[PDB]
Structure 1
Amino acid sequence: VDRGLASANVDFAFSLYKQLVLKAPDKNVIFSPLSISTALAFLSLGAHNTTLTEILKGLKFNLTETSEAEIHQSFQHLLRTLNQSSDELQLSMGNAMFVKEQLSLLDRFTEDAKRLYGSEAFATDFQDSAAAKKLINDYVKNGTRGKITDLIKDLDSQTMMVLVNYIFFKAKFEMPFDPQDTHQSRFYLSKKKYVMVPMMSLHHLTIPYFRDEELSCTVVQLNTGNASALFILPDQDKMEEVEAMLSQETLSRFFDSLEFREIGELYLPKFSISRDYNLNDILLQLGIEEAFTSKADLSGITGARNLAVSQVVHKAVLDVFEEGTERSAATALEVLFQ
């Protein structure tokens, strides 16, 4: 079960990554694969037939290796681990459904949604579009502690439901950078194109390290957790080559080959990046198609085939600074009547 979930998880994340890159290969990318898959798995609690199997297969699950109940139990357990507080990290993760006030939901669905995904149901007047957008955007703003502010830009006044996930991940560096040692330095977009950025620096530090000569890249860890950050640094003009090798096989080789090593100097930029996306094109390419058409079967939500997905949107933010890092993301799945 676990190795089956792991294979699905990595395959979904890297498949999504490459599709995001394909739309604009030179842009910064920041996203949360788990936020997106959690929203879709939550949706699948109410799906049936081809609509259900397409969602679960689009998340790269094999339903003969891992049952539906085993998939939802994995999400439930994970969601619980992503709500933690300590002097080294703050983690939050939440799900919600915003539902047209009069709309009847099956008890099985609202029971499953609360138990497995932690989701409440918020009665919402979508016909007052500005107020409904503020309600949802405020929920995400609260959950991401101000970092994701405008997840919903446009919202159909005839919306029936919006399923929302957010994730917040703030982590202190075990060895913080001293801001006195941050100085403007070149960042090479390519061998011949470069800008000046504030570059943090540390001397004489012992971190997990792997020089991968076959892939022309260096892999390190900054930071002790149950989910530590891996940094992958391709040699100049080898990013495309490294991206082409991303796989479960390559990731496990990276992790298995890390060794503690004394590093003379480490330079890392101080920066923030943000991206937002509409994921309809990509989810259709992953084979999640019936959920978007009038053949959609979401009758596990309401007792009738009277709902279909209209829009899936995602926004994510990454902040890197001397004391540590902050990451946040949110996903909204918008649903119309049929």
Structure 2
Amino acid sequence: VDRGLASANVDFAFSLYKQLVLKAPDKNVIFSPLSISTALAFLSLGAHNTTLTEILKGLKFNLTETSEAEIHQSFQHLLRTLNELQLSMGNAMFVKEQLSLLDRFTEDAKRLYGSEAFATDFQDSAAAKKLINDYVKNGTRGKITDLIKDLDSQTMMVLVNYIFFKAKFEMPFDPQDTHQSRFYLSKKKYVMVPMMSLHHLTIPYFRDEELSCTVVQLNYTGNASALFILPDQDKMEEVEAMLSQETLSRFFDSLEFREIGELYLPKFSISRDYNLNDILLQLGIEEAFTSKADLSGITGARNLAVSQVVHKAVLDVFEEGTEASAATALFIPLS
């Protein structure tokens, strides 16, 4: 484990989370921070000067402790380690067929991020959109099929990351024990939802009396698990106020095996679609979006700039396990 990379990605996950909640503080949230970190790190491979340092600092790296090369190497090592359960991540670039790219960039993009270069006729707008969405559908096994909605005819490249996850609970719920039960959207508003249940369960457990929340971990068959954080009623805002790498680590470190009388978990499926421009600007990635953008590591010229960053993610939780998928796309016209 490169501890430096692991730390940066967790910090970036909680910064992103807070910004996503700031948009609409009472709505469902689902995203893949790993997908977004990897897509932006891929982008930084082609960046120089202030454009580059802003991306890498935005991703929460300390450029003083680590070099650009070591960061790309850490992501290469991460991607190889990730790809029992089903898990895959992919990177791609879709490039205007005539656009001249540096050999060193396409070679490095393939070697470090596993990325191919797809020739694409962006002026045939609808066919380019179908080529990209098809790539994402394939990578996500049909879970994400409309990441690209609009696509300007003068786009020069689109960088794409996807992640697909499908795992079985090692202690699965029995659908015979799924019953409609109340879910309290607030203290005074509640609806009936399908509520799964498990009886007499020994799982890692931690009651945080100071933060008024209960933490449990449900393992999947692989090396992956789901950490669930359940704030007491009306304590969600309080618990969100403490979220950080340090707090999450303290949560994991405080888990102990404990026999649960019963566990009730809703069966649910949620989906969210985000434009990340405002959030990336807030996190300090600014020059990439302006005419001062320096993506000359891609083409040999300061001729490219980012116009749009979008992210789509889905999460399905059911008796047998969990399915989750996400994709990130970066739209890059001429500067």
Task: Check whether the contact 1:5–1:66 (CA below 8 A) recurs between aligned residues.
Answer: no
Q: Deviations over 1:184-239 (max 9, x none)?
A: 00000111111110000110111011111111111111116433211111111111
Q: Deviations over 1:256-297 (max 9, x none)?
A: 111111111011101100000000000000010000011000
| Larger CA deviation: 220-229 vs 298-307 | 220-229
Please state whether the residue corresponding to 1:332 is helix, strand or coil: strand
| Larger CA deviation: 226-235 vs 178-187 | 226-235
Taking the aligned partners of 1:197 and 1:16, their CA distance within structure 2 comes to 29
Taking the aligned partners of 1:336 and 1:312, their CA distance within structure 2 comes to 12
Q: CA deviation at 1:4?
A: 2.9
* Equivalent runs, 1:191-202 vs 2, <5 Å: 191-202=187-198
Taking the aligned partners of 1:175 and 1:47, their CA distance within structure 2 comes to 46
Task: Check whether the contact 1:173–1:325 (CA below 8 A) recurs between aligned residues.
Answer: yes
Q: CA deviation at 1:7?
A: 2.9
| Larger CA deviation: 275-284 vs 8-17 | 8-17
Task: Check whether the contact 1:46–1:299 (CA below 8 A) recurs between aligned residues.
Answer: yes
Task: Check whether the contact 2:173–2:198 (CA below 8 A) recurs between aligned residues.
Answer: yes
Taking the aligned partners of 1:172 and 1:281, their CA distance within structure 2 comes to 36
* Equivalent runs, 1:134-283 vs 2, <5 Å: 134-223=130-219, 225-283=222-280
Taking the aligned partners of 1:43 and 1:247, their CA distance within structure 2 comes to 26
Task: Check whether the contact 1:317–1:328 (CA below 8 A) recurs between aligned residues.
Answer: yes
Taking the aligned partners of 2:268 and 2:225, their CA distance within structure 1 comes to 20
Taking the aligned partners of 1:166 and 1:41, their CA distance within structure 2 comes to 14
Taking the aligned partners of 2:192 and 2:82, their CA distance within structure 1 comes to 36
Task: Provide the identity percentage.
Answer: 98
Q: CA deviation at 1:10?
A: 1.8
Q: CA deviation at 1:3?
A: 3.5
Please state whether the residue corresponding to 1:228 is helix, strand or coil: strand
| Larger CA deviation: 115-124 vs 4-13 | 4-13
Q: CA deviation at 1:82?
A: 2.3
Task: Check whether the contact 2:30–2:272 (CA below 8 A) recurs between aligned residues.
Answer: yes
Task: Check whether the contact 1:43–1:163 (CA below 8 A) recurs between aligned residues.
Answer: yes
Q: Deviations over 1:129-175 (max 9, x none)?
A: 11000100010000000101100110001000000000001110001
Please state whether the residue corresponding to 2:306 is helix, strand or coil: strand
Task: Check whether the contact 1:137–1:149 (CA below 8 A) recurs between aligned residues.
Answer: yes
Please state whether the residue corresponding to 2:307 is helix, strand or coil: strand
Taking the aligned partners of 2:232 and 2:78, their CA distance within structure 1 comes to 35
CA-based RMSD of the aligned residues comes to 1.0
Taking the aligned partners of 1:271 and 1:7, their CA distance within structure 2 comes to 30
| Larger CA deviation: 15-24 vs 217-226 | 217-226
Please state whether the residue corresponding to 1:307 is helix, strand or coil: coil
Taking the aligned partners of 1:40 and 1:261, their CA distance within structure 2 comes to 40
Q: Give TM-score scaled by structure 2 length.
A: 0.98
Q: CA deviation at 1:65?
A: 1.0
Who is 2:69 aligned against?
A: 69
Task: Check whether the contact 1:187–1:194 (CA below 8 A) recurs between aligned residues.
Answer: yes
Taking the aligned partners of 1:77 and 1:119, their CA distance within structure 2 comes to 14
Please state whether the residue corresponding to 2:270 is helix, strand or coil: strand
Consecutive unaligned residues of structure 1, counting only runs of 5 or more, are none
Task: Check whether the contact 2:167–2:222 (CA below 8 A) recurs between aligned residues.
Answer: no
Task: Check whether the contact 1:151–1:315 (CA below 8 A) recurs between aligned residues.
Answer: yes
Consecutive unaligned residues of structure 2, counting only runs of 5 or more, are none
